[PDB]
């Protein structure tokens, strides 16, 4: 099984 | 908290089962922070350098799927815990901090952003204490200085009865 990006963080 | 985050998810259970089978990630990559899951656990990786960085822990020796199929790693330290994939496009590159500032910020999975002490090259103390299931999926995630310039990884939590009262971080130098 592969490593899922399922969201993201958006910094500022 | 000088520094702000906020947080977008980009899929659900169905497409996480999938393209964790296919290897293929067709969505648009963003952030300096990706959020990430497999089988069995949830974590986040930081983009530092064009390199996705995480917990060795949590993603063990597992491709990461990109838009070209699965990416394999780039860096796999077993024993400093640390694994990095090379950066899908899109993603935001931080840069290493430096500076040796020793106010940080913890940024978690769901996008709040703690105030840490920094007490030795991998250890911090939160300045107020936090449930540790709080802390849980942000394995991965950044400790920034003041100027959002990142200086380490977190790993885990140092806790006693469900509460954490500092953090086991990844310096960058590892890195
Ligand atoms: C990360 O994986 C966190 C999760 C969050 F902090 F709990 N990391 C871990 O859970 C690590 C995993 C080991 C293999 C490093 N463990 C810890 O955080 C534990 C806490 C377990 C508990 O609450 O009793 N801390 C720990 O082992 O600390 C020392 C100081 C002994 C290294 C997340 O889940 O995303």
């Given amino acids: 099984g592969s490593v899922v990006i399922v969201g993201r963080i958006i910094l500022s | ?175």
């Fill in chain 2, 1 to 175: 908290a000088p520094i702000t985050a906020y947080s977008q998810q980009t899929r659900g259970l169905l497409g996480c089962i999938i393209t964790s089978l296919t290897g293929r990630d067709k969505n648009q990559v963003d952030g300096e922070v990706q959020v990430l899951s497999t089988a069995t656990q949830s974590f986040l990786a930081t983009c530092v350098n064009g390199v996705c960085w995480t917990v060795y822990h949590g993603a063990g020796s597992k491709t990461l799927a990109g838009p070209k199929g699965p990416i394999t790693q780039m860096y796999t330290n077993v024993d400093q815990d640390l694994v990095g994939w090379p950066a899908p496009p899109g993603a935001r590159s931080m840069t290493p901090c430096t500076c040796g500032s020793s106010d940080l910020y913890l940024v978690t999975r769901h996008a709040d952003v703690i105030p840490v002490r920094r007490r030795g090259d991998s250890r911090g103390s939160l300045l107020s204490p936090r449930p540790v299931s709080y802390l849980k999926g942000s394995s991965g995630g950044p400790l920034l200085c003041p100027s959002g310039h990142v200086v380490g990884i977190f790993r885990a939590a140092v806790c006693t009865r469900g509460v954490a009262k500092a953090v086991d971080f990844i310096p960058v130098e590892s890195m």
